[PDB]
From a paper:
We describe complex formation between a designed pentameric β-propeller and the anionic macrocycle sulfonato-calixarene (sclx8), as characterized by X-ray crystallography and NMR spectroscopy. Each blade of this β-propeller is a 47-residue monomer of ∼5.2 kDa (yielding a pentamer of ∼26 kDa) that binds one equivalent of N-acetylglucosamine (GlcNAc). The Asn33Lys mutation makes the protein cationic, with a calculated isoelectric point, pI ∼ 8. As is typical of β-propellers, Pent has a toroidal structure with a funnel-like central channel.
Despite their unusual morphology, diffraction data extending to 1.6 Å resolution were collected from the crystals grown in the presence of MgCl2. The calixarene, evident in the unbiased electron density map, is sandwiched between two molecules of Pent arranged as a dimer. This dimer assembles via the concave pockets of each protein, with the Ser2 and Asp21 side chains on each subunit contributing to the Pent–Pent interface. The calixarene was refined at 60% occupancy and with high B-factors (∼50 Å2 vs ∼30 Å2 for the protein), which may be due to fluxionality of the macrocycle between the two binding sites available in the Pent–Pent dimer. The increased ionic strength of the crystallization conditions in form II (including 50 mM MgCl2 or 0.1 M Bis-Tris) versus form I may have altered the protein–calixarene assembly in favor of protein dimerization. This hosting action of the protein is emphasized in crystal form II, where a Pent dimer encapsulates one sclx8.
Numbering used by the authors:
A (entry chain A), B (entry chain B), C (entry chain E), D (entry chain C), E (entry chain D): 2 to 48
């Protein structure tokens, strides 16, 4: 629970480290947007 | 109180994590501008 | 003490959170620049 | 273990500090991508 | 003692806070680049 890092790439993609995993995707648009469920998993550990 | 993350997207929108929630909005232009009151809630928790 | 956050906006302005307040201004060019005295107070608390 | 800093350059390259060393490279695109194995070492300590 | 902050400006300059001092410079190109030996000191304390 909670992100360790949460930051943008210069194209506007949101990146986040959550439970040692790395995710990316376009940023959420509302509190109805389950961002983590639709984010792409781009790293399985070590972050 | 207190933000856990406070950062910019490349289009100039300010993003912030406050009390596990995610907020965005144009940055304040003066200390009369209550940013958190006018920011768009874009995540209800898990941040 | 020091800063809680210190980060750039995409237009090149340096932002900083210091003693719960939000500051912005052009980045310092030498150690003779008192950036905190020089920056614009854009938020009086809650940061 | 884990990263101490993880952030983007405006040229699109991902930078990270891991165990006091500095690395850069294209961001990972999947959890098969061993980013730290293929990243360019650009700093052997002090970070 | 490492860096407290390490981040880019949108023109590609790397900024870092180290022992409460603020440094800037082009990012290191390889592990043979002593960045902090050649970085510009732009803040002597308070960071
Ligand atoms: C910090 C880092 O590069 N972690 C990666 C991880 O994301 C990836 O899923 C795994 C693939 O084997 O390799 C590494 O552990
Ligand atoms: C980290 C993350 O994606 N959190 C979101 C939250 O912001 C959103 O309000 C909720 C919708 O049900 O889904 C997830 O919990
Ligand atoms: C986090 C946040 O938006 N803080 C603001 C503060 O910056 C501003 O000076 C004040 C104006 O009334 O309102 C809020 O407290
Ligand atoms: C913080 C910093 O500038 N560290 C560098 C290190 O990355 C580099 O590999 C070394 C070369 O001798 O010099 C310095 O220690
Ligand atoms: C956070 C900040 O602005 N620190 C500066 C420091 O960089 C500068 O060298 C000194 C010179 O007067 O003034 C301030 O203390």
């Amino acid at each position: 629970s909670g992100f360790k890092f949460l930051f943008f790439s210069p194209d506007g993609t949101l990146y986040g480290v959550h439970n040692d995993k790395l995710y990316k995707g376009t940023p959420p648009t509302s509190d109805k947007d389950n961002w983590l469920a639709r984010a792409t998993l781009i790293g399985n550990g070590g972050w």
